[PDB]
Amino acid sequence: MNTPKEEFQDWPIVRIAAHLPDLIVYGHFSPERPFMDYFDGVLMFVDISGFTAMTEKFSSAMYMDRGAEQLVEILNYHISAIVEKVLIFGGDILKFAGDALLALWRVERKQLKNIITVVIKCSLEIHGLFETVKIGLAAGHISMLVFGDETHSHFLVIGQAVDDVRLAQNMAQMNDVILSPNCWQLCDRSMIEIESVPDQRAVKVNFLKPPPNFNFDEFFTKCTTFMHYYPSGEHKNLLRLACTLKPDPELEMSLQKYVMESILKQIDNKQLQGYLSELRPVTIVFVNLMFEDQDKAEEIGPAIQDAYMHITSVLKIFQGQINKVFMFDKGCSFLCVFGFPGEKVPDELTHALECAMDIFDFCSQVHKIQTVSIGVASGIVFCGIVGHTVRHEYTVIGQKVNLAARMMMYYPGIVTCDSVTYNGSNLPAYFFKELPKKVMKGVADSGPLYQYWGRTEK
Amino acid sequence: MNTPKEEFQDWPIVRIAAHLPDLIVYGHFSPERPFMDYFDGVLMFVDISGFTAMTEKFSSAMYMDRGAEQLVEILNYHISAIVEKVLIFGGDILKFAGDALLALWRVERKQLKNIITVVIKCSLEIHGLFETVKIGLAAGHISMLVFGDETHSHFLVIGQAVDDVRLAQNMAQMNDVILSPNCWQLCDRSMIEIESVPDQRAVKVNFLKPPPNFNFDEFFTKCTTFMHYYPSGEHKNLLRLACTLKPDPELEMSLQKYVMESILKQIDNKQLQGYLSELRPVTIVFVNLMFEDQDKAEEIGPAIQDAYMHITSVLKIFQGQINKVFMFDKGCSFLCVFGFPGEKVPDELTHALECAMDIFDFCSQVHKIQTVSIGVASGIVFCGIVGHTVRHEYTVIGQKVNLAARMMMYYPGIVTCDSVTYNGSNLPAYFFKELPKKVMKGVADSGPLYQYWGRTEK
Amino acid sequence: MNTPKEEFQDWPIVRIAAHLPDLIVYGHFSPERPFMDYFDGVLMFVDISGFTAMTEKFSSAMYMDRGAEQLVEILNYHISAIVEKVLIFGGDILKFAGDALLALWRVERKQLKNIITVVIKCSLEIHGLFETVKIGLAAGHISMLVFGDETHSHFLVIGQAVDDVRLAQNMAQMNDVILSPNCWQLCDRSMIEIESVPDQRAVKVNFLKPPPNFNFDEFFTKCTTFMHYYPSGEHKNLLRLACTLKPDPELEMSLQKYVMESILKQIDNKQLQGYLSELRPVTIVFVNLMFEDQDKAEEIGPAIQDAYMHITSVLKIFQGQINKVFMFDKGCSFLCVFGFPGEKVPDELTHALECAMDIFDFCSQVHKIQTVSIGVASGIVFCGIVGHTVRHEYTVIGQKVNLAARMMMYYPGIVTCDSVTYNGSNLPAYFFKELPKKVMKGVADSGPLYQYWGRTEK
Ligand SMILES: O=S(=O)(O)c1cc(N=C=S)ccc1/C=C/c1ccc(N=C=S)cc1S(=O)(=O)O
């Protein structure tokens, strides 16, 4: 009696799971929105910095109209390798943004010290890939927030460790691994040699220096006791346990709400795989919400949910889409896009400004939101699915994405727009205020920037 | 000198062979139509009963417009596992219908007793998959009929064993394996413990109870002597020998006639794989032909061929399609569909009724056809490719499919239609007769049913 | 710590490399056009002769409108096997044309003798595949020419060995391996038993007859010392080293210029794989350029580049495409096609004739081009990607392709066209001269042929 090979099955549920972290795939949340959960862990924020900045080059004539295809190929070649390192070291990739990613090792509180050592070694092996990247590490309390409606879901992680991992990675020169102050407090100081970072309490990792009897592979194996989903036994050859997910209509209904409809169309073999990689004209509306205390999920959770319900309603009317939601050092940020896969309708610009204003007015009156700031910028951006075969997400990358992000942070409390938007809108000039030029870290040649004042003086 | 791996090649001939049983793939029939062949074997009819009945749920809003995709994923997850069991135990899947399938073990007459034991063990392992299905078995003489024209072919199996395997499976409660009377007569009674089935000569299998020296794997190996196409030797790792078919234009011309054109388009990589899975509005015309003796191929074969030639001509004019032909307990049944893949033209309904009537009038005068009955029903049905990667077929599933089937059996001798068809047609009311309501085993809430009387009183 | 399998990655750069020989993939040429390089090697020209001639049959009704699909399946089944033999024996497939291919073993001059023995054994194993094909071999000096513009590149090999390998294969009856005179001069005469070929200095291989101590596998291993890209070590399981190419935007920009845009669309998953296999009406314009000395790259290179710049400009205006460039026994030949993938515009014929004439007038005044001859023929041709998964090219095959080729050689110095072109053009009759009928080796039933005289008497 024959025994044919049990082969890998790429069911639709597995294809959906590649877009999501274990944090969501293996969650089992209540239905209320917002939903909040509390835990401890180590976070790694890795950035292939400088990439977005150079992406303008893939529009150049030398790429012969295959710039998008070449960009996603070269980006994925490098990002995939980082992803695979994270996964083999037992981490969960939470989110991709631009040319950056955020990873989590969730563990019981008593094990933070040893897991920090695992994450440090991972980081150093990540740098080792590129000898021929900047990394920030944080550790401590983390909260999860899940928000959405009956057909869409989004998640965020929040708290001091999340705020920290950002600060840490901003400080890294190239090739550094930086630890947050709390990460450095909690870590196995006997193992790692560090330097001070001038005017900072964070530190830099110089070397990992294990004791005589130390064997990293045996240490790692011990650490796996505490990793719930590390592929093992019969499945030790897989990068993710999620590769083994079986059809389950209830679970697939829950997971599909996290993925955009155009991605699902691809998943369902109803659209060619190449259709979503493109260098496409869009308008970015980057919405930032600031709170008095952004580390307290129970305070900020309802407010984010309320803002989301309104944003999604305003976006719906124009086929805008939320591409991502991230925490920033200051606030919760919604990266919204007008002009995505087959959503290309006329007056994208006037509508984008009116949408922004509507969001601004509504969110300004939401209980607990202290400040709303919105940046609007328009031009050619890369859109595509970035990451590894087993862990990837649809992402937008471009100078206009980062300009919209920087505008909302450098011009808080108002709706701002770039010159393409201002000129294109053909709204009358007195709907705007021409703004002073600010030097914006990460940006140059911004062109004139404007505030969208609105239809009336007020 | 290198020796690179001989890799599996998915040639178009192999892709076509996945839609067909070994009975056809390895046949070598004459060109006459009808063609008839005679043999002996064991038949297994397996039904995941209740599924079709629940399929209405995949149209519900909770599935967020991916009902078809979720339905085919979950159905195939379960059906695939049954298919793989059948194939490993040496059976040939003949046909899929709805959430049911028919399998055959063809063997020389002297080996029926031992092959029944193999099929019994298979059936029990099939039930074992679902601890967390109903099976009927028959054995004896079987005839094959192949009918068609110069560009299309269809096959049927016929005879008392085929009639029996239906009766047997109708009697099974859930989780039963039922044997036909002849199967029970021919089987190894020392091996199997059975109960009587009240008011039936068929029996139910309680257990397989082998003797002391018995070793099922060694018994199975012996049985493989008699299985012409059991994958073996170098190919013992394959589910089907048909996976090894090589390009052969003559054979591919013959096999392609059994597959619908839209499936071939997919096979040829000229249509996306996802296009054929859909929850689509169609009109089912289910045609039943009854004979004085439906076990005699030489009598019924020419009549079925004659009926087929006319049906196919009438269907052609409106882009109706034959989806399947099955034997029923009473008669040969053609499952015809209007509105399939890209065949969506207006007045589907009036045309469907006129087509039905034309078929009714013509088939009624075919020598040897005793009664024609036709059921017409219209609404949302699932269409898609069901089964395993290596053995699958395009199938339609839905409450309207089963309503059309039950109408043709409970209202014999006339053309009947459902309320959607009647109301939609906007043919005048006196073209119809409103019918008494019958309780139809397998159905509820049918709505009013009508006879299509036709254009004249008569 | 897990170690998941390093799996084969089908990056876009690798997909592009399948369309190209190692000669180009691993080249590192200067940017000037023309570019010329000089080396030594053995050439194998293999033809599955008679195939093109029978291809008319795949339009017959018996193929039920899947003639193109069946043709490419059966052709690739056989061609793939030849390709795999060439690759395992260490050769580089340079080009596919019709049902023929050209392969090269490049080696240092001192090793020609031993490499000829390897190529002879390969050829005999190729014949061994088909017991149930004609091969010509040449050896000696070879020049490479690369020509093109800023966005397209083409290459040719040139010289006496290239002229020889053609002569050699023209002489082969079926099943022969013929050696050129120089190949026979350079080979290991102690190993091979040959016959004279009447009225020729080339010879035919009867047998390979190695000495007592000879072990072909050990001899082959020795020969691999001299094969730069033979897959080895960790990669000994691969057919080509090019399967291991990593993303490299500079290299991909260079390689993509050799591939047509519609093929790149497929590569990029932006068009279905099946779209390019078709039996399609086109017009072939086959352009032949003759030189006083076609073995001297430094003479003919600039002239071919000049002709190319003009051809490509004339083709551009009508969406004609260069499908291939080959050396012929006499001259350089450009196989140009009007009506390719989505390039189907009206008056294909008048435009094709005017294009031809423009090319004729311009190329006639290019320094060093002695004679220009152009054949124009129109009808149904097969287009598709022919070869192996790892080494394949887009090719056109058909009686009209070979008619255009034979016209340009049998009616040198003029633009000729077939009856379909002449009649279809509805240009006035005095734009043409009706030609005497020539018996053209490889052709019958040509229909009347015409010269395109042009708009004026002159
Ligand atoms: O029955 S429903 O389709 O409405 C359904 C609603 C749910 N709502 C929520 S929350 C969660 C699940 C769910 C259906 C599950 C199945 C539907 C069809 C199957 N068919 C087969 S073969 C098997 C399953 S199973 O997952 O229960 O095995």
Ligand SMILES: O=S(=O)(O)c1cc(N=C=S)ccc1/C=C/c1ccc(N=C=S)cc1S(=O)(=O)O
């Ligand atoms: O590529 S694999 O089969 O290994 C695979 C592993 C995953 N592992 C996990 S967790 C998740 C997905 C996955 C395959 C994805 C696709 C494979 C073929 C497609 N053709 C089309 S359209 C589209 C997709 S899609 O999901 O990326 O859209």
Ligand SMILES: O=S(=O)(O)c1cc(N=C=S)ccc1/C=C/c1ccc(N=C=S)cc1S(=O)(=O)O
């Ligand atoms: O653009 S980044 O790759 O740095 C990025 C990745 C994220 N996630 C992932 S995966 C989340 C946020 C994020 C960008 C953050 C900022 C963007 C603009 C700012 N302007 C000012 S002043 C400040 C910040 S901050 O949050 O870093 O303080």
Ligand SMILES: O=S(=O)(O)c1cc(N=C=S)ccc1/C=C/c1ccc(N=C=S)cc1S(=O)(=O)O
């Ligand atoms: O020659 S025909 O295309 O008309 C033909 C008619 C048949 N009618 C019937 S019944 C059955 C087969 C058939 C053609 C077979 C081939 C056609 C092309 C091949 N080319 C190559 S390389 C090889 C074969 S083979 O199968 O004979 O090897």
Ligand SMILES: O=S(=O)(O)c1cc(N=C=S)ccc1/C=C/c1ccc(N=C=S)cc1S(=O)(=O)O
């Ligand atoms: O999936 S496998 O390559 O193992 C395979 C085994 C079979 N074994 C046997 S017997 C038959 C078919 C088969 C593959 C089928 C497809 C693979 C990719 C496709 N892409 C598209 S459009 C479409 C098909 S199709 O044939 O299902 O249409």
Ligand SMILES: O=S(=O)(O)c1cc(N=C=S)ccc1/C=C/c1ccc(N=C=S)cc1S(=O)(=O)O
């Ligand atoms: O619908 S089923 O899954 O039971 C089915 C599968 C088949 N094949 C496969 S694979 C072939 C037939 C078939 C349905 C048969 C009937 C459908 C309606 C009837 N109404 C009455 S009275 C009686 C029968 S019967 O033939 O079972 O007597």
Ligand SMILES: O=S(=O)(O)c1cc(N=C=S)ccc1/C=C/c1ccc(N=C=S)cc1S(=O)(=O)O
């Ligand atoms: O920077 S450009 O895009 O203009 C460029 C021009 C060339 N012109 C020529 S000749 C050759 C290469 C080339 C760009 C190379 C890269 C572009 C983006 C990368 N991103 C990441 S992660 C990595 C590379 S790499 O190959 O240099 O590693």
Ligand SMILES: O=S(=O)(O)c1cc(N=C=S)ccc1/C=C/c1ccc(N=C=S)cc1S(=O)(=O)O
């Ligand atoms: O098929 S393999 O993945 O082994 C492969 C090996 C190669 N080896 C080398 S060197 C080059 C290419 C190659 C795969 C090609 C494709 C695979 C899937 C496609 N789907 C679509 S559209 C399209 C292509 S394509 O490149 O042929 O267009």
Ligand SMILES: O=S(=O)(O)c1cc(N=C=S)ccc1/C=C/c1ccc(N=C=S)cc1S(=O)(=O)O
């Ligand atoms: O058509 S073929 O398969 O023989 C062919 C394959 C090639 N390449 C590849 S891969 C390159 C050329 C080629 C055809 C050459 C000719 C075509 C028509 C001729 N008419 C006359 S007189 C003479 C020649 S010749 O060059 O063989 O003398």
